[model samples]
Target: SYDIQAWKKQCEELLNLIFQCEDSEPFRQPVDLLEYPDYRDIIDTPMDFATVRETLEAGNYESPMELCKDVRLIFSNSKAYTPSKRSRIYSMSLRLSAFFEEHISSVLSDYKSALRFHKRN
Candidate 1:
């Protein structure tokens, strides 16, 4: 683990570099801030196809909104994957993860209980 407080300061400095650096204006607005009124749905997050693949392959815990790939169709069954279906899957996955966290935890607990109470008992 790293020092949380120090890391937070470093992160803030890095973020400021984009808007207030010498190459940039002394007080510049971020691209997202500049265009959000005209394009409300557009986002500037770093989560993209590459990041999603890296996250899944790395087996790290990430938000489904961030892990927005359907590899079952992307690489395994490209012919069966439509653009609409891929978008649906990504949106649904995000909603499911956000809303069903507690339900998933409950299901996991039940599975653990069942395993512990098998014939060994």
Candidate 2:
């Protein structure tokens, strides 16, 4: 039930899916401060896929929810910077954010199911 390694693997799978999305490139790394000098002004706590990957690699995540929060921050920070209907970054954030929600929900669902199964035994 309490399996940090398994949870790490599960989060990695979600990260792999994010890596393939063409729009994920923007959120793949920290914002280019040179290109968007005002980025830090807009987003105080900057987060990105690269940061998430680092965190996961270090085995810092104790649960899937922690992974869920950090990954969502990547898109949420993007949306905070460009909250417009026309901006590609905003649109991509919405898409990737939604995609993450879909997969992460199932990830938790399965984990919960396994936890309860083990508990009943």
Candidate 3:
């Protein structure tokens, strides 16, 4: 069996990083989730956050491995009896992103017009 306490500790550390909190948890790459032996091969090949940001900066909407497409496949077993919770999470994430884009784009357009007007005067 996997060490439950160790996994909890690692999970707390991961949550700290996600929240950008500078608590007792250091930036450690603890691999409790990597108990599955071949999981490393799958995760290692995927693009990290920096890669995604770089693509965004280049105005590229098409990613090499989109979240719902390529990334979701990794979270599920192809031959499994049941679907994965990760799929649901991905769907929710896309929905939230769509909402944010719609709202933010309108505000950004207004900001751009204000800047342009100021420059004209």
Q: With candidate 1 superimposed using the best TM-score fit, by how many Å does residue 101's alpha carbon deviate from the native?
A: 3.2
Candidate 1, 21-55: lDDT as tens digits: 33323112222336335422433232322333344
lDDT of 3 at 72: 31
Query: Which rank order by lDDT, best down to worst?
Result: 2, 3, 1
The most accurate candidate by TM-score is: 2
lDDT of 3: 0.35
lDDT of 2 by residue, 1-121 (tens): 5442466677888899999999798888888899988888788898989899898899787777788888878877877888577898889888888888887886787777767776876
**Local error of candidate 1 at 13, Å?**
48
How many steric overlaps are in each model, in order? 0, 0, 0
TM-score of each: 0.24, 0.86, 0.32
What is candidate 3's CA lDDT for residue 70? 29
**lDDT of candidates 1 onward, in order:** 0.34, 0.81, 0.35
Instruction: State the number of backbone clashes in model 3.
Output: 0
Candidate 2 lDDT: 0.81
